[PDB]
PDB file of C-alpha atoms and ligand atoms in Angstrom:
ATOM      1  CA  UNK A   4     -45.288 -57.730  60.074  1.00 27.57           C
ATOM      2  CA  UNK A   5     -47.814 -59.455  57.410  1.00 22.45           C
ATOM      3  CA  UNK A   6     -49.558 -56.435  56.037  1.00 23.04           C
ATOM      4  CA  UNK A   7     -52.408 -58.510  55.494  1.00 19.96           C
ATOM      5  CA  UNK A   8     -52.886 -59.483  59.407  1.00 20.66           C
ATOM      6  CA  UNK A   9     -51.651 -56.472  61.045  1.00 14.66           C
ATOM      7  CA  UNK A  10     -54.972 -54.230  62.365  1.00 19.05           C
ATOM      8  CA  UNK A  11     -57.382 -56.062  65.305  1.00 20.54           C
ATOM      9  CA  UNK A  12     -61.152 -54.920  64.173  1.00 22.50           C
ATOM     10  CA  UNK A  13     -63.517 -53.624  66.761  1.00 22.90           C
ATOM     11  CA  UNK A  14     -66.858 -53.904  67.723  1.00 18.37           C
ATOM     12  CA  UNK A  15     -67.085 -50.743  69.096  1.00 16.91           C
ATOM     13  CA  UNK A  16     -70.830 -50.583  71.621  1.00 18.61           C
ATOM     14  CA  UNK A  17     -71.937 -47.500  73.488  1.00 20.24           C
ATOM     15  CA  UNK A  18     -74.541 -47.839  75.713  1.00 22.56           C
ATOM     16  CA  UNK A  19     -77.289 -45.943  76.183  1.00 27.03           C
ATOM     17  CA  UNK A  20     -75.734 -43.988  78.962  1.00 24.27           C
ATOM     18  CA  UNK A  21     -73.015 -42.751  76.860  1.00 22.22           C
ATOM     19  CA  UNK A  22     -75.815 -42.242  74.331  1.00 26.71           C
ATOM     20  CA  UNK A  23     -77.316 -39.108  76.439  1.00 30.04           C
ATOM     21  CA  UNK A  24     -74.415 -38.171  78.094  1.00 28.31           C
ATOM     22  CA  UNK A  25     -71.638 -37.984  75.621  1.00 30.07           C
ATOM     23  CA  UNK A  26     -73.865 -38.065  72.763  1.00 27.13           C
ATOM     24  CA  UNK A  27     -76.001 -35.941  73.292  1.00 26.84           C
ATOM     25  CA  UNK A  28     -79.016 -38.313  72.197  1.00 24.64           C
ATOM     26  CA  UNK A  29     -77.526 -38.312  68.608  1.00 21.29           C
ATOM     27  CA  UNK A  30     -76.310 -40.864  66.586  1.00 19.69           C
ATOM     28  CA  UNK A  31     -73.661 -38.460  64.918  1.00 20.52           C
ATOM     29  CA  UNK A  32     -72.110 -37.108  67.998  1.00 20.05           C
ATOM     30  CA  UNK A  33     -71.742 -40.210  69.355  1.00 22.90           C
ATOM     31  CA  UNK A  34     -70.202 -42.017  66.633  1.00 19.61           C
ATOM     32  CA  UNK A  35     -67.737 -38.808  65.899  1.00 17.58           C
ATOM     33  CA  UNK A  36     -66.505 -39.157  69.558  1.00 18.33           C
ATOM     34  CA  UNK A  37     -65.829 -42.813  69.359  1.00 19.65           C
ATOM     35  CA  UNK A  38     -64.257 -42.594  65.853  1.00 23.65           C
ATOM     36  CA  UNK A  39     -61.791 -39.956  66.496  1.00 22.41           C
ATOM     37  CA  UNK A  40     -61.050 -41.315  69.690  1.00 21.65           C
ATOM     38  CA  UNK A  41     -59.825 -44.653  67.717  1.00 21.66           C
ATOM     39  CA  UNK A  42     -58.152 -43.177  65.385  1.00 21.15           C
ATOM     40  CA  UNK A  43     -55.836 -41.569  68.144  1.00 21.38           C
ATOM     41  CA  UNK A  44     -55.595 -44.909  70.334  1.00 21.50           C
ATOM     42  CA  UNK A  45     -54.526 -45.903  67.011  1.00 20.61           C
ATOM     43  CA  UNK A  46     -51.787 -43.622  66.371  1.00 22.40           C
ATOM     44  CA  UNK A  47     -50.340 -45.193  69.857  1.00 20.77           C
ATOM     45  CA  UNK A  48     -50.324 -48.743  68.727  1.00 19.16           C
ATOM     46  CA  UNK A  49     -49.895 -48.347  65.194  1.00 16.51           C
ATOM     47  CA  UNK A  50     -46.579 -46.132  65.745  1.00 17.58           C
ATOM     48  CA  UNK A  51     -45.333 -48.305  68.678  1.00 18.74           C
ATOM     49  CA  UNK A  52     -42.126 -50.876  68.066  1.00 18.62           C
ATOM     50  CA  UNK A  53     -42.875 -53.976  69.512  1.00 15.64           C
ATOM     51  CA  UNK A  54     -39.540 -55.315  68.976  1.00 13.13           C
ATOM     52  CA  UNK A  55     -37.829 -52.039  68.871  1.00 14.32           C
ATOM     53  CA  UNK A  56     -37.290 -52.272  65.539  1.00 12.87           C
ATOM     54  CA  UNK A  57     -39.177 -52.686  62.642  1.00 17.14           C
ATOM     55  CA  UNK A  58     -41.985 -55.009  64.320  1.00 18.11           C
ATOM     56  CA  UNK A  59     -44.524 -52.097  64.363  1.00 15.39           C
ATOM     57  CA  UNK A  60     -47.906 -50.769  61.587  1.00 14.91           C
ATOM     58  CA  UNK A  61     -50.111 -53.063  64.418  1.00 20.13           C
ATOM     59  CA  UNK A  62     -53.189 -51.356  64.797  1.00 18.88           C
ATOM     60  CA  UNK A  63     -57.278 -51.541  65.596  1.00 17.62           C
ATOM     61  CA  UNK A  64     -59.685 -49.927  63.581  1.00 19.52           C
ATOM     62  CA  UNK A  65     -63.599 -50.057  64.159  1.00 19.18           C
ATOM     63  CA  UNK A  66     -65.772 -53.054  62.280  1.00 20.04           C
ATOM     64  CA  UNK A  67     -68.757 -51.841  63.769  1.00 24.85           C
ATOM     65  CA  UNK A  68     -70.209 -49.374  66.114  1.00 25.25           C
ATOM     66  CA  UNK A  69     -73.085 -50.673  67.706  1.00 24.23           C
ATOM     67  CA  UNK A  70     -75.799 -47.824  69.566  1.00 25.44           C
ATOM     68  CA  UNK A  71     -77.523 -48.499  72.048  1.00 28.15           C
ATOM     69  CA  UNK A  72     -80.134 -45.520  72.257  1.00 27.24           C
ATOM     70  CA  UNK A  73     -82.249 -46.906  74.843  1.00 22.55           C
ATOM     71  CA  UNK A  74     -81.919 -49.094  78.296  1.00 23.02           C
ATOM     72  CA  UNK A  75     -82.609 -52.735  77.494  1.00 27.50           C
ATOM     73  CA  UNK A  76     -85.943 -53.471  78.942  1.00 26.59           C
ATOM     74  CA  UNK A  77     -85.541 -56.791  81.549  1.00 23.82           C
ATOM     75  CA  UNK A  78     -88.084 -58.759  83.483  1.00 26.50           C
ATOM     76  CA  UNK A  79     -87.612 -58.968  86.976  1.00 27.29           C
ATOM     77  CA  UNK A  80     -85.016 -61.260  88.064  1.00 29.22           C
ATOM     78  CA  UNK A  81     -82.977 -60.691  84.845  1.00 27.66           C
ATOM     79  CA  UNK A  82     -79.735 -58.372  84.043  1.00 29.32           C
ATOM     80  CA  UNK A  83     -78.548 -57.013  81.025  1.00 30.19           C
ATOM     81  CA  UNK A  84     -75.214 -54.691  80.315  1.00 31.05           C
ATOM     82  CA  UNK A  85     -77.716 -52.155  78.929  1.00 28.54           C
ATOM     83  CA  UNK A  86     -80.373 -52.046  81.558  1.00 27.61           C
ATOM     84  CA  UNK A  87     -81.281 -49.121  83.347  1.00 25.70           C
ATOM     85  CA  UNK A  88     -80.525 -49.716  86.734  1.00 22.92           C
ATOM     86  CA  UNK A  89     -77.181 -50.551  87.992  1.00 28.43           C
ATOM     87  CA  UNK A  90     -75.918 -53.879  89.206  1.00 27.09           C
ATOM     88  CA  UNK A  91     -75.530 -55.171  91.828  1.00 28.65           C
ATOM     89  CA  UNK A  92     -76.315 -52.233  93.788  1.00 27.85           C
ATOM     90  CA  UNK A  93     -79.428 -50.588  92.399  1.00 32.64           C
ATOM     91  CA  UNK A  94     -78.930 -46.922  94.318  1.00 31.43           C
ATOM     92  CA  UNK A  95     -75.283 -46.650  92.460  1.00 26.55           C
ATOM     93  CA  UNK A  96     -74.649 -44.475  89.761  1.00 24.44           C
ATOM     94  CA  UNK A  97     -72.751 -47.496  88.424  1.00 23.98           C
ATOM     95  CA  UNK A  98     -72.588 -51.495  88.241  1.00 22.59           C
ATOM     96  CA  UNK A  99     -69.667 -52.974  89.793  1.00 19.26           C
ATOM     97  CA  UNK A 100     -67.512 -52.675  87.272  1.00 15.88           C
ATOM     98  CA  UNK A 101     -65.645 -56.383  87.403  1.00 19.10           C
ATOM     99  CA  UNK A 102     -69.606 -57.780  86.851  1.00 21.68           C
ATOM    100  CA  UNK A 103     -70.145 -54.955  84.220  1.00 22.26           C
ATOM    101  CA  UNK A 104     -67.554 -56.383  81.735  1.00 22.37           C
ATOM    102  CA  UNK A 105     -68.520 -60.573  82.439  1.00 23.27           C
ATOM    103  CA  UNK A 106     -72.350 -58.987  82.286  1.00 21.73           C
ATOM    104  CA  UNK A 107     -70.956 -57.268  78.532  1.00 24.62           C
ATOM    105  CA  UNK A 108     -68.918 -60.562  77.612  1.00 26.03           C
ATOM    106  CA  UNK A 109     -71.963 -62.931  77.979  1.00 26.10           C
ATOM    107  CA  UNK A 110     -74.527 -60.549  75.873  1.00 25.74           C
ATOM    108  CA  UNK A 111     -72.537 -59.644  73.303  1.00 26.42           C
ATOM    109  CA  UNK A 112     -71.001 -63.447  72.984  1.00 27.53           C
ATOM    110  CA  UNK A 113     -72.244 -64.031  69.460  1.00 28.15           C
ATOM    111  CA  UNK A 114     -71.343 -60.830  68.353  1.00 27.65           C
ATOM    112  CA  UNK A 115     -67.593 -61.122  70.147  1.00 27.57           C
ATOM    113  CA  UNK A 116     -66.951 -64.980  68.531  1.00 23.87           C
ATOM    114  CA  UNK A 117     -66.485 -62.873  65.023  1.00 28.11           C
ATOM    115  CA  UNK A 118     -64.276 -60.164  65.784  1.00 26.62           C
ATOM    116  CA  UNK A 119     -60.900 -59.616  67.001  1.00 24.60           C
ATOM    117  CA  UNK A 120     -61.891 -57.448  70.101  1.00 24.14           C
ATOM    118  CA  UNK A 121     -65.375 -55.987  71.734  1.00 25.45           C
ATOM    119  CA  UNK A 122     -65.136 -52.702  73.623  1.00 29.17           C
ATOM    120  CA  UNK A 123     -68.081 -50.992  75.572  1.00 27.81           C
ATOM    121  CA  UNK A 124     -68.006 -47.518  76.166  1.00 25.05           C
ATOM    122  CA  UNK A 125     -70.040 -46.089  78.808  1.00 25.97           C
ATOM    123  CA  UNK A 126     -70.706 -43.243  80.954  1.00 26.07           C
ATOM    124  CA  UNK A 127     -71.197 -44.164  84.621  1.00 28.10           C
ATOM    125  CA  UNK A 128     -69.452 -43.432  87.813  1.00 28.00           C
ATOM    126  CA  UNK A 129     -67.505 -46.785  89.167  1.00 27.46           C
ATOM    127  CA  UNK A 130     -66.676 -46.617  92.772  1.00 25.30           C
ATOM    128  CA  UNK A 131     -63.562 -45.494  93.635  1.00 27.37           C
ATOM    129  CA  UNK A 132     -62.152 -43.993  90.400  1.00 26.89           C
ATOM    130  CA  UNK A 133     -61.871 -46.678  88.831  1.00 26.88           C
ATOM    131  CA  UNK A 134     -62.727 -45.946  84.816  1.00 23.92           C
ATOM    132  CA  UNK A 135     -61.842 -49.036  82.948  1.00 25.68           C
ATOM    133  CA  UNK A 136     -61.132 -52.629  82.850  1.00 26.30           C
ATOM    134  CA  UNK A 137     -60.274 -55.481  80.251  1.00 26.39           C
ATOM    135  CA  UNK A 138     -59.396 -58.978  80.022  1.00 27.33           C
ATOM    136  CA  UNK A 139     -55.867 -60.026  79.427  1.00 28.66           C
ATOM    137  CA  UNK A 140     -52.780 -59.129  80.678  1.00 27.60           C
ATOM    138  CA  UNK A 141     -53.643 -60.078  84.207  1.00 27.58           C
ATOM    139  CA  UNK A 142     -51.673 -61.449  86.877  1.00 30.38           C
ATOM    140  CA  UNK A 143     -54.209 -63.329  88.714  1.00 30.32           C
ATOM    141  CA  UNK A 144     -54.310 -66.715  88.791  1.00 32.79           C
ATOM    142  CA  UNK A 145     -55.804 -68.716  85.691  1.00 30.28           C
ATOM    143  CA  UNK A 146     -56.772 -65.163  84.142  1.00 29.18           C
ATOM    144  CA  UNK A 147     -57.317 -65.079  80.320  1.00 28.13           C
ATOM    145  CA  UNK A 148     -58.473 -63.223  77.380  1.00 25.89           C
ATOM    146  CA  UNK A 149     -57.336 -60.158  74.975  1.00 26.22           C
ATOM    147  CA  UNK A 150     -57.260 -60.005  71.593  1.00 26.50           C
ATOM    148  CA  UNK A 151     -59.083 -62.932  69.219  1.00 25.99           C
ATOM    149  CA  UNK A 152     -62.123 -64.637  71.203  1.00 27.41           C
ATOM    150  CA  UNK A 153     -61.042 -67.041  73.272  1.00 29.02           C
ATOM    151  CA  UNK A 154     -63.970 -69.034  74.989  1.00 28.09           C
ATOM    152  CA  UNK A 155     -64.717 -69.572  78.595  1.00 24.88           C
ATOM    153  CA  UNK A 156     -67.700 -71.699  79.661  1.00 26.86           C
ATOM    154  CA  UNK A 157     -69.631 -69.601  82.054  1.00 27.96           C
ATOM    155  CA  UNK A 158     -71.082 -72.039  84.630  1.00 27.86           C
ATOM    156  CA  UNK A 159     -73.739 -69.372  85.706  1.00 27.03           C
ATOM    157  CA  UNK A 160     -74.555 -68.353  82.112  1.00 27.43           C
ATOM    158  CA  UNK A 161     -74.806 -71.727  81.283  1.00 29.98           C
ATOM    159  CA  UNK A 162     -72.812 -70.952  77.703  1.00 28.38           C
ATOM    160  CA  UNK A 163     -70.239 -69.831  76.390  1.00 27.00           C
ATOM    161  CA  UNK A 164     -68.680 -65.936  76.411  1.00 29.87           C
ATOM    162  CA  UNK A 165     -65.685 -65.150  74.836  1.00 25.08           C
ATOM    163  CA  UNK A 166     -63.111 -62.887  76.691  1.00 26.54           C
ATOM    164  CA  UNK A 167     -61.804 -60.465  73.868  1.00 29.93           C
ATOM    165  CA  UNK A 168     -63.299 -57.515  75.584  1.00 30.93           C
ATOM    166  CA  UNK A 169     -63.024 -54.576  77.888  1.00 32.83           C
ATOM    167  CA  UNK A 170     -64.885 -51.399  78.766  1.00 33.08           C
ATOM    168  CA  UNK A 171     -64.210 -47.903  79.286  1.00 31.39           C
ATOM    169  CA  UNK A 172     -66.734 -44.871  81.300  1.00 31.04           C
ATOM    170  CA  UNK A 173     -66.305 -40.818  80.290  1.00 28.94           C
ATOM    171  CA  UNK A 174     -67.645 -40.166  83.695  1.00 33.57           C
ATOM    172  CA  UNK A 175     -65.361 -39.902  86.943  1.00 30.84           C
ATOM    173  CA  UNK A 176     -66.719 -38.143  89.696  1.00 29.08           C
ATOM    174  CA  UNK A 177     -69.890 -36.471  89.057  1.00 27.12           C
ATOM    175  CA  UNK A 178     -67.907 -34.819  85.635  1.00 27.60           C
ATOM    176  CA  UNK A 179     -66.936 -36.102  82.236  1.00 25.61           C
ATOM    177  CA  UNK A 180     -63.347 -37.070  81.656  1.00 27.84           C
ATOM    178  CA  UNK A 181     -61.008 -34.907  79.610  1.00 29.44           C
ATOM    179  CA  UNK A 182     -60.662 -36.653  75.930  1.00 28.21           C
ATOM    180  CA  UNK A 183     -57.049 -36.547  76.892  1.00 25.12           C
ATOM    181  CA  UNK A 184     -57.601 -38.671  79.320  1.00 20.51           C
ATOM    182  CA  UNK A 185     -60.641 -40.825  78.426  1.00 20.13           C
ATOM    183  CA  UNK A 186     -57.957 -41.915  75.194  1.00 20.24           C
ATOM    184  CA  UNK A 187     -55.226 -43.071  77.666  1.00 21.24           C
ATOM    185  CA  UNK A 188     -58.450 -45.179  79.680  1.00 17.51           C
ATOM    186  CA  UNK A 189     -58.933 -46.748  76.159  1.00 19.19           C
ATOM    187  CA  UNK A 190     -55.171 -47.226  75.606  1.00 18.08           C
ATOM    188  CA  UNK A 191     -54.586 -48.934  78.804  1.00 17.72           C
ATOM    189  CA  UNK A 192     -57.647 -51.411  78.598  1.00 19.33           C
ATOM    190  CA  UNK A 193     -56.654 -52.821  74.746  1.00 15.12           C
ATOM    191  CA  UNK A 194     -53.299 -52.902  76.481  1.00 13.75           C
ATOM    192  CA  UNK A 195     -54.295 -55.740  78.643  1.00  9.98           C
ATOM    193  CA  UNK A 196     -56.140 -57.145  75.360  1.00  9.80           C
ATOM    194  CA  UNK A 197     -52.728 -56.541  73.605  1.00 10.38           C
ATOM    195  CA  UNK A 198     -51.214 -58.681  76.802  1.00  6.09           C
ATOM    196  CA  UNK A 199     -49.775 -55.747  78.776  1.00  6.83           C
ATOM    197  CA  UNK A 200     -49.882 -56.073  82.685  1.00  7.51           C
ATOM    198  CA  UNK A 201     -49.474 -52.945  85.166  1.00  7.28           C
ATOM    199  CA  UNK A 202     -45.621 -51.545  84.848  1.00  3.34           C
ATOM    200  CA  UNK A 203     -43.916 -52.230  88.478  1.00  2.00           C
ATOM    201  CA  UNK A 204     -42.243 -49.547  90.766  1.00  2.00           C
ATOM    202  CA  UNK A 205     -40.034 -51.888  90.693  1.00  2.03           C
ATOM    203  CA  UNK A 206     -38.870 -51.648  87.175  1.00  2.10           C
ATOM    204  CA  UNK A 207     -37.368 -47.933  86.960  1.00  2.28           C
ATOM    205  CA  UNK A 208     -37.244 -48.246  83.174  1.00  4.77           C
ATOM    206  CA  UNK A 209     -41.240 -48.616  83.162  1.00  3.16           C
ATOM    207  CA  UNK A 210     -42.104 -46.921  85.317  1.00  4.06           C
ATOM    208  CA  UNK A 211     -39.983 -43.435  85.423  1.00  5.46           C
ATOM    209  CA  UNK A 212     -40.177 -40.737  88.003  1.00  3.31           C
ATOM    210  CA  UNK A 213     -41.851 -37.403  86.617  1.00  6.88           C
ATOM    211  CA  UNK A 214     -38.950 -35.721  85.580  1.00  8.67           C
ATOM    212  CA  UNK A 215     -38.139 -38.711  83.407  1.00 10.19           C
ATOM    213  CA  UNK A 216     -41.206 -38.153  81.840  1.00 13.20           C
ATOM    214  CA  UNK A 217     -43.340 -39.723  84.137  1.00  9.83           C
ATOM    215  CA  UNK A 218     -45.473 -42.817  83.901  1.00 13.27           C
ATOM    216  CA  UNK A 219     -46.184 -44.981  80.760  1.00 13.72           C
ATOM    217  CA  UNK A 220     -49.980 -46.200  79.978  1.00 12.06           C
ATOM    218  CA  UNK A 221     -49.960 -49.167  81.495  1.00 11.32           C
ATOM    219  CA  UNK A 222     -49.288 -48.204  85.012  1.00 16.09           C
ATOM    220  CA  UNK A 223     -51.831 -48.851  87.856  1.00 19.13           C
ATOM    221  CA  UNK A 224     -52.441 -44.964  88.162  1.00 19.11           C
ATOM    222  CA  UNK A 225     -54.089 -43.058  86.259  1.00 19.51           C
ATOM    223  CA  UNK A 226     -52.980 -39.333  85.244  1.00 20.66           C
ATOM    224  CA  UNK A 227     -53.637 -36.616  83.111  1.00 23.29           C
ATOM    225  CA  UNK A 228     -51.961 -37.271  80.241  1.00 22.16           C
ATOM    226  CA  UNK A 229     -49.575 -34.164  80.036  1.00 24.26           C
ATOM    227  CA  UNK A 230     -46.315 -35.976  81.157  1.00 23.73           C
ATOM    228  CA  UNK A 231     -43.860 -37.702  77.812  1.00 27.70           C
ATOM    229  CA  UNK A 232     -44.054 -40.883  78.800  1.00 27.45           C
ATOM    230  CA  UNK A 233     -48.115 -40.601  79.554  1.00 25.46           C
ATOM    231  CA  UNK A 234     -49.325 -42.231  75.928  1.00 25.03           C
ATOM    232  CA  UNK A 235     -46.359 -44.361  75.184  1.00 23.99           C
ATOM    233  CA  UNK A 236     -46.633 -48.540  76.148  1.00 25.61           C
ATOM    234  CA  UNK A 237     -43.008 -49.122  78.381  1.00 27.29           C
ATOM    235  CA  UNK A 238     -40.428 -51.420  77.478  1.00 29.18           C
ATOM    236  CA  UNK A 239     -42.025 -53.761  79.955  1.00 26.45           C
ATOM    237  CA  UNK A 240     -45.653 -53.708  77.806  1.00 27.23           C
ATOM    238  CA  UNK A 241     -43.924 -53.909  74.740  1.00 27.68           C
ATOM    239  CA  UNK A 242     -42.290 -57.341  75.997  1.00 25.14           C
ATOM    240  CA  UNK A 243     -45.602 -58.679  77.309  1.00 23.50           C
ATOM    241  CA  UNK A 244     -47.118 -58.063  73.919  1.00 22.34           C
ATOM    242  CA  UNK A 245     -44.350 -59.372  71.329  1.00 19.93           C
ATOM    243  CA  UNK A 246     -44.539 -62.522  73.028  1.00 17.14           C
ATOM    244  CA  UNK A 247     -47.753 -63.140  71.760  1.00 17.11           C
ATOM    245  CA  UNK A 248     -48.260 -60.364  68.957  1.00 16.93           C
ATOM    246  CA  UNK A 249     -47.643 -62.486  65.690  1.00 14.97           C
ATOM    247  CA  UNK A 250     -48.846 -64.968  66.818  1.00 11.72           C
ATOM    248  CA  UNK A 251     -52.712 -63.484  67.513  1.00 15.19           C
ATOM    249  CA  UNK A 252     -52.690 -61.319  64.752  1.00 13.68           C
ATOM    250  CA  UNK A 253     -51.799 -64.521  62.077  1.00 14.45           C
ATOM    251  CA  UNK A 254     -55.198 -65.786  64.719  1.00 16.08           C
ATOM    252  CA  UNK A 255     -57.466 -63.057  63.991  1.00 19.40           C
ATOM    253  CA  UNK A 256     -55.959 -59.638  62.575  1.00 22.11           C
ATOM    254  CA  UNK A 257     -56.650 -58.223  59.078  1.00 23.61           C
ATOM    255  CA  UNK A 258     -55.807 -56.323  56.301  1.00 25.64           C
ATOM    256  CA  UNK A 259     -55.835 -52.294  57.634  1.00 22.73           C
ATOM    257  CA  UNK A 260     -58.828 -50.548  55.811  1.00 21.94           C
ATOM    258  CA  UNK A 261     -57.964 -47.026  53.885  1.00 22.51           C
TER     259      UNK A 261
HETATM  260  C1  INN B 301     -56.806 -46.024  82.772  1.00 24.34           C
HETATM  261  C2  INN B 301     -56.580 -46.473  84.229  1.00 24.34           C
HETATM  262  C3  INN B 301     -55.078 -46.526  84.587  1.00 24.34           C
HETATM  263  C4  INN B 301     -57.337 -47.772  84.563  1.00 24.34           C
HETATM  264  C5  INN B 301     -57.363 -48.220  86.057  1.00 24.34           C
HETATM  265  C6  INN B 301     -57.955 -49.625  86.307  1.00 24.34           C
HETATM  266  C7  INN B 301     -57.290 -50.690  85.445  1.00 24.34           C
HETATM  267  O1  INN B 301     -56.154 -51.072  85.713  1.00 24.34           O
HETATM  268  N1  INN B 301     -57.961 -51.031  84.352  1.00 24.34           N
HETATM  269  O2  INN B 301     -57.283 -51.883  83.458  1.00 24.34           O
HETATM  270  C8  INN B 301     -58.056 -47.207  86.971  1.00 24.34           C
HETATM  271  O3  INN B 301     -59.264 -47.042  86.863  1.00 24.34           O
HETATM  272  N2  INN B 301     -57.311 -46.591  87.906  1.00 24.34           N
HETATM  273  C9  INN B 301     -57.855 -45.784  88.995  1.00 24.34           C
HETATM  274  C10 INN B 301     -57.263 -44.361  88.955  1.00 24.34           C
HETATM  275  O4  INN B 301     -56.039 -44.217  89.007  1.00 24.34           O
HETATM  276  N3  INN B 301     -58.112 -43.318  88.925  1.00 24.34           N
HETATM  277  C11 INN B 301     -57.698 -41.938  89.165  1.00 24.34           C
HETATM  278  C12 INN B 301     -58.440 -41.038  88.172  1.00 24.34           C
HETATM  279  C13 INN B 301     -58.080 -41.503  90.596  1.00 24.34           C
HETATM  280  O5  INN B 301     -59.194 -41.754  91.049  1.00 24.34           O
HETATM  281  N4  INN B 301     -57.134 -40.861  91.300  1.00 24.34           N
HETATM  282  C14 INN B 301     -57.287 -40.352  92.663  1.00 24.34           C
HETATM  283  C15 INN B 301     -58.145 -41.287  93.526  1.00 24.34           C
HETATM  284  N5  INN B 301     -57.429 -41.673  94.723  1.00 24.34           N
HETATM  285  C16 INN B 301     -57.593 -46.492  90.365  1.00 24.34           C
HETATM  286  C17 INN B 301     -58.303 -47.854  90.458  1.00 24.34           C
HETATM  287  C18 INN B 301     -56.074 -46.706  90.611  1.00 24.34           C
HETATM  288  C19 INN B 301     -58.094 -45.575  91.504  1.00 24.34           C
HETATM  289 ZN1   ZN B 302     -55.228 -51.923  84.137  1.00 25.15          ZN
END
């Protein structure tokens, strides 16, 4: 591991839902939250064996955290990952969160093209308990992005977005998520940046029964967090990721900041 390229840098945006409701409306709250929640995704990564052996010290820390204290103001016709309302159904608590993260990816573009990753963090109620999503480590047909921008000519934006990002929300159903369990959302969503895809049923050794210790991150489920396996990455994710690992972070890691 090149100690000089071994940490993906973040540009870490809350929105100005997660503002008021995790933030209180303050600057310092919400900036505490997001840091120490970091840090601990960062513990994960940072301890974790690729290789199962001495290919580990990979790790994100935060560039930049960028507040949004306000909704963006929009004229009619136009969207915004900020706005007030949601999209594409107004009377939602929540966007739909698949055109949430392409809405994120195409306003933050310029701001995405210089770092290794772009996470939002929000605090809105996606249908169906769904709390995160990311790009990479997707099955789906012609399905890109993760870690290091990688472009992708949006024929509807008419540009280009890059897809190094992913989003996590605090809020699932009607009540904020435990921070137990808002750092596994986090977790799971750099996973697919990482390259990760879901752990199978049909893989035993990723994806254990509870008295085995239960589930690893990167299965389709979410849970609590208070099984063993819960905040470790499975054999299965750590294979996804090594393929790839050097070779991104030689791409676009850097040098770990004290
Ligand atoms: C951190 C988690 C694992 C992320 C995934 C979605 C995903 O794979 N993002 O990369 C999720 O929201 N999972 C939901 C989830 O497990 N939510 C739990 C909290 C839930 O609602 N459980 C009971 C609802 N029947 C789904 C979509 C499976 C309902
Ligand atoms: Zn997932």
């Amino acid at each position: 591991p090149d100690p000089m390229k071994n940490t993906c840098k973040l540009l870490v945006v809350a929105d100005h839902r997660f503002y008021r409701y995790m933030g209180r409306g303050e600057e310092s709250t919400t900036t505490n939250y997001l840091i120490e929640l970091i840090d601990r995704v960062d513990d994960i990564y940072r301890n974790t064996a690729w290789d199962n052996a001495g290919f580990k010290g990979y790790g994100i820390q935060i560039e930049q955290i960028r507040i949004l204290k306000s909704p963006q103001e929009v004229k009619p016709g136009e969207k915004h990952y900020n706005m007030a309302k949601s999209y594409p159904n107004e009377e939602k608590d929540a966007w739909d969160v698949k055109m949430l993260l392409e809405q994120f990816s195409f306003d933050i573009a310029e701001e995405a093209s210089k770092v290794c990753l772009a996470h939002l963090f929000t605090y809105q109620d996606f249908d169906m308990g769904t709390l995160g999503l990311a790009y990479g480590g997707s099955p789906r047909a012609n399905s890109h992005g993760g870690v290091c921008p990688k472009a992708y000519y949006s024929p509807v934006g008419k540009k280009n977005i890059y897809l190094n990002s992913g989003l996590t929300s605090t809020k699932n159903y009607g009540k904020t998520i435990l921070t137990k369990e808002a750092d596994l959302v986090t977790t799971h969503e750099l996973g697919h940046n990482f390259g990760a895809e879901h752990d199978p049923d049909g893989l035993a050794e990723c994806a254990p029964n509870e008295d085995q210790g239960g589930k690893y991150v990167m299965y389709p489920i979410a849970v609590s967090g208070d099984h063993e396996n819960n905040k470790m990455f499975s054999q299965c994710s750590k294979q996804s990721i090594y393929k790839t690992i050097e070779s991104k972070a030689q791409e676009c890691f850097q040098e770990r900041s004290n």
